[PDB]
Paper text:
The structure of OmIA and Ls-AChBP was solved at 2.47 Å resolution. A tight homopentameric ring assembly of subunits was observed for the OmIA/Ls-AChBP complex, where OmIA occupied all five binding pockets located between two adjacent protomers. The N and C termini of bound OmIA orientated towards the top and bottom of the LBP, respectively, with the central helix abutting into the binding pocket. Structural superimposition with the HEPES/Ls-AChBP structure revealed that the C-loop of Ls-AChBP moved out a comparable distance (9.3 ± 0.4 Å from the Cys187 Cα atom) and had a similar backbone orientation to previously characterised co-crystal structures. Each of the five bound OmIA molecules interacted in a similar orientation (RMSD = 0.090 ± 0.005 Å) at the interface between two adjacent Ls-AChBP protomers that formed the principal and complementary binding sides. Most interactions on the principal side were between His5 and Ala7 of OmIA and C-loop residues Tyr185–Tyr192, as well as interactions between the disulfide bridge of OmIA and the vicinal disulfide Cys188-Cys189 of Ls-AChBP. His5 resided in a pocket formed by aromatic side-chain residues, specifically Tyr89, Tyr192 and Tyr185, and formed hydrogen bond with Tyr89 and the backbone oxygen of Glu193. On the complementary side, OmIA_Asn9 interacted with a surface comprising charged residue Lys34, polar residues Ser32, Gln55, Tyr164, and hydrophobic residue Met114, in which hydrogen bonds were seen between Asn9/Gln55 and Asn9/Tyr164. OmIA_Val10 interacted in a pocket formed by Thr144 on the principal side and Arg104, Leu112 and Met114 on the complementary side of Ls-AChBP. The surface interacting with OmIA_Asn11 in the co-crystal structure comprised mostly polar and charged residues from both the principal (Thr144, Glu149 and Tyr192) and complementary faces of each subunit interface (Gln73 and Arg104), where hydrogen backbone were seen between Asn11/Thr144 and Asn11/Gln73.
OmIA, α-conotoxin purified from Conus omaria, is an α4/7-conotoxins that competitively antagonises α7 nAChRs. nAChRs are prototypical ligand-gated ion channels found in the central and peripheral nervous system, and recently in other biological systems such as in immune system, muscles, skin and lung. Among different nAChRs subtypes, the homopentameric α7 nAChR is one of the most abundant nAChRs in the nervous system and also in many non-neuronal cells. We determined the co-crystal structure of OmIA with Lymnae stagnalis acetylcholine binding protein (Ls-AChBP) that identified His5, Val10 and Asn11 as key determinants for the high potency of OmIA at α7 nAChRs.
Author numbering:
A (entry chain H), E (entry chain I), H (entry chain G), I (entry chain J), J (entry chain F): 1 to 17
B (entry chain D): 1 to 155, 157 to 158, 161 to 205
C (entry chain C), D (entry chain E), F (entry chain B): 1 to 205
G (entry chain A): 1 to 157, 161 to 205
The structure:
C-alpha cells in the first residue's frame, strides 16, 4: 500500500504515519 | 503562488533553530520505524546493524500557505526547517542517512520527513538463532525537549518493507509510547519503544 | 554571449531547491545505470558492492538561452542546479559519488548529469557461481515526488553492458534490464513511479 | 520575549571564538561522564572503545534573559555557542558525537550540553577478566586554557552508573570515580587542571 | 530517575549534574 | 603589489566555475602521475590501492599580474580557482587528497596543482609476482569537456619514478608510461582525449 | 581591551590565505612531533599508525596588540588564522585531528598550535620485534613554499609524552633539518626528518 | 563509442541515452 | 612538566617548543 | 632533485613535469 512507497507515505499524512 | 514562491517564502520564514510550538502547546511529533534490513547481528556483543525508514511527521503552522490556486505540497531541504531532535538512546553509531535530505511540506503546515537510516544498536540479541527469535528494543525520544515542548507518538504493530533477501526475517515489530513522570520534576518525558522481534532464517 | 555570461545567467535563474515543473506537468527524468564494476559480492549476507554511471537527463526550460553566435552547451556545478532526488529503495549504503560534480547544460535547457557512483545493495546473490548467474534487483525512484511532479523514464531497457563493464572484474554481466513500474494505491489519486534494474551477472569461469 | 527572540539574542551574543569570562574570573565548567556502553576492549593493545554521555555545564551571564512572561529555557544548536575546548588527553580517536548537537540554555545563563560520544582510549586494560577488573583512566581538560580562564570540576566524585549503563554490554561497571587534579609547574605561575575519570569494569562471568 | 533521561537531565540543572 | 593584493586580484578575476578558455581555444592541461606508493594489490579481484602526486598544470591568463617589484608566484587555495574536472575512468574509490589544497600561481597566469592522492583502481594485476610484473592502466580525462574546451597532455611519458617512489613499498616500479589518446567518433565532430598511465610494477623478491 | 576586542581585531586583521611574511623574510615555523602512541604496526606492508602532538609555532606580527592593561594571550580558532601548509611527504592517510582546533595567540603575534593528530605512514618497520627495534622516518615540510617564504625548523630540545600503555616503547628520536639548493632553481627547499626508533615491549 | 566516454555521452544527448 | 600538558605548552612559548 | 620535493616541483614548471 501507499505507506511502503516512500513518496506516497510523505505525500499522504491522513493515510500514513 | 508557484513552487518557487512557496519555497522562497518557506526559506525566508522558517527558523530551523526555533521549535514551532503554537500557544505553548507541544509540537506533536509522530514517529514510526519501518525496518528494511538487518545487515549484521552479533549475539556475543549484543549489537545489531539495521536499515530503517524513520517516518516522522509534525506541524509548523508558520509554513502554511493558501493552496486554492497553488500547489498544496512541496519538497523542502531539511536544513531550511526545524526538525525534532530525536535520537535513539541505545544507539552506538551515528545515524547514517542514505537518502536525499528533503522533507515534504503540506500547505496546512504539516511536515513529513522519512529518511532511510543505517545505524548500530546495543540490544538483546539472545535467541536470534531460535524459532522465538531475538527481541531488540530501540528507545527513541527528544534529546533536549520534554513533553510540553515535543510530544512523541507511534503509528503499533513488517512484510511490506523488509527485504526478502536479508539473512533474517521479522516476526513482529511493536511501537509503543512510554510517558514517565519523575518525583523531582513536574513535566513528563516521552519516548517511543520499538521492539524488533526477528530471527535468522532456516 | 560567452561562457561567463551563460553561467552568470544560469546562476541568476536556476533555483537548486525548486523542481522545474512547467504548468503542473511532471519533469520527465531519464535514467540509465551503466554498470562499470562489481567489486564485492557476499552470497551468505546477500550484499553486493557495485560501481555504475548514473546517466540522468531532464529539462529546465528556464536555463535556456539563444545559441546562434554563442556556445550551445556549458558545464555547470550541480550545486547551482536542481537535480532529481533519486534514491535506491534497497540500498544499504550512501551513494559515494567518485567523479567531479558537474552537469552539462544545453542551450535548449536540457541538463545531463552522469556521476560515477559506488554503492552497496541488499540483493539476491544466489547462483552467482553458476552459469545462469545471480540476478540482483535495484529499485530507483524519487524520494519525495510522485508521478505528477517527476516521471522516471528508463532508457536502455535491455543491454549486456559490454561497452561499459570492466574487463578486469572477476564477474561478467549476462544482462541488465531497466523497467518502469508505476503503482496507484486505492487511498491516493496519484501514481508512484520507479525504475527496476535487474543486474544478471556471474563469477567468470 | 518569545522563543524566537531569545534564540536570536543568544546566537548574536554567544561568540564561539570568545570565552565568556566575566571580570577576568575563570569560566567554571563542570564535566561528568556517564558511561553507557563498553563495546570493545583489547588487553593486548590496551585499548577500549566506549560510549558515554559527556555532561558539560557552564554559565554565560550575558545570555540571561527575563523569563517572567517568556520560556525559562531553550534548546540551542551548539554551533551558535561558545563551548569549552575539552579533550581527552589519552584519546586515540576523534570523539564521534551520536546525538543532535543541541544544548539547553536556562534564562539565568546556564548552558547544559550532554552529547552521547563514542571514542577509543589507550588505557590500562589488565585484569579485565578478573573479579577486581580493569581500571581505565581518562584525563579530560582544556586543550588551550589554563585554570584562570577555564576551571574544570567533576560534579559527582563517585558512581556505579547503574542507571545509565547498558545491561546488554559484555562488560559490567564496578565503579566510576571522577576527580579534579591541579598542577602548578615551577616554570609558570598559573595552574593546570583536569578531570581524571577512572572506569573500573570487568567482563561478565 | 530524571538524570538518565537526556532531556530531563539538561532541563533540570538543580537535580542533575 | 604584495601577496595580499595578488590574492585579492585573483579572487576578483577568477571564476572557479568558469573554464578560462581564451578566444574559444581549449585550456591546455598537462597531467602527470608520480607514484609514491603501492599499498595493496589483489590479483584475484584485480584491484590496486596507490598513492601518487597528480601534477596538473594549466594557464588562466586573466590571473596574470605585473611582477617587476612584486612576488612572481603565490600559493593560492584551489577553492579560489577553476580546476579541470579530471577523473580516472577506472577508479573505484573517491580520490582521497592527503595534502593542503593549495596551488601555485605564477605571474604569467600559469597554475600548478600537485595534490598527493590515495585512490583504488580496477586494473590488470596479473603477473605481479613475476619478473615481467603487472601492468596496471589508469585512464584520466575530463569528465564533461571535449578537446576544444580542455586538452589533456602528458609531460614525461617514460620514467621509472625512482625519484618519487617509496623504497619501503612491498612493490617496485619497473616502468611508468604516460600517453595521450585522442578518439573521434563518427556521430560527433569533436575529439575525446585521455591520458593513459601504464604502471608496470612487481612484488619485490 | 577585553578578549572580545582582541578577537574582533584579529578577525578584522588576519588574512588566513596570505603568508604573514615581514619585509620579505620567511615566516619561521618551528615544528616538533611529540609521540603519544604507536597504535598499529605492519611489518609486511611497512605501515605504522601513530598519534602525536604536532607542536607548531610561528609569528604573525599583524595580529599583535598592546597588552598593558589587556590579556597577553587568547585562544583563537585556526580557521581565523593563516597556518603553514605542512605535510608529511610519506603519509598514506589524511591527518585525523583529534582535538579542538584552537591555537594560542600571544600579544606580540606569536601563534602556537598543537593539535593531536592520528596518521598512517609508510615507514621502515623491519626489526620492530627485535631489541634494536625499527626506525620509522617521517619527513615534514611545506607543500608549496620554498625557504624564502617559509622556513621549517625543529625546536631546540620522548617519553614524558608517550603512553605507558602502548605495546611499543620508544628507544630514540632523532630530528634532522635538511635544506637543499639545486643549481636549476634559485631558492632552497627544506624539510624536517623525524626518526622514531621503537620496538614491541617484552 | 561516444556513449562510453563520459564527456562524449553528456555532450551528445541525441546520440546517447 | 609544563610541556607535556597541552595548554601549558602553548601558553608558555619561552619554556616549551 | 628539485622535482622530488613537492614545493620545488610546483615552483619550477620549466624544470619539473
Amino acid at each position: 500500500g501507499c505507506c511502503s512507497h516512500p513518496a506516497c507515505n510523505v505525500n499522504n499524512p491522513h493515510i500514513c504515519g | 503562488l508557484d513552487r518557487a514562491d512557496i519555497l522562497y517564502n518557506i526559506r525566508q520564514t522558517s527558523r530551523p533553530d526555533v521549535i514551532p510550538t503554537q500557544r505553548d502547546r507541544p509540537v506533536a511529533v509522530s514517529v514510526s520505524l519501518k525496518f528494511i534490513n538487518i545487515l549484521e547481528v552479533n549475539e556475543i556483543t549484543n549489537e545489531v546493524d539495521v536499515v530503517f525508514w524513520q517516518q516522522t511527521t509534525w506541524s509548523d503552522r508558520t509554513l502554511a500557505w493558501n493552496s486554492s490556486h497553488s500547489p498544496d505540497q512541496v519538497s523542502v531541504p531539511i536544513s531550511s526547517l526545524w526538525v525534532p531532535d530525536l535520537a535513539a538512546y541505545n544507539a552506538i553509531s551515528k545515524p547514517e542517512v542514505l537518502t536525499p535530505q528533503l522533507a515534504r511540506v503540506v500547505s496546512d503546515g504539516e511536515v513529513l520527513y522519512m529518511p532511510s537510516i543505517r545505524q548500530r544498536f546495543s540490544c538483546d540479541v539472545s535467541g536470534v538463532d531460535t524459532e522465538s527469535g531475538a527481541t531488540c528494543r530501540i528507545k527513541i525520544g527528544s534529546w533536549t525537549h520534554h513533553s510540553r515542548e515535543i510530544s512523541v507518538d507511534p503509528t503499533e504493530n513488517d512484510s511490506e518493507y523488509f527485504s526478502q533477501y536479508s539473512r533474517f526475517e521479522i516476526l513482529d515489530v511493536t511501537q509503543k509510547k512510554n510517558s514517565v513522570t519523575y518525583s523531582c520534576c513536574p513535566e513528563a518525558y516521552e519516548d517511543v519503544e520499538v521492539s524488533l522481534n526477528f530471527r535468522k532464517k532456516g
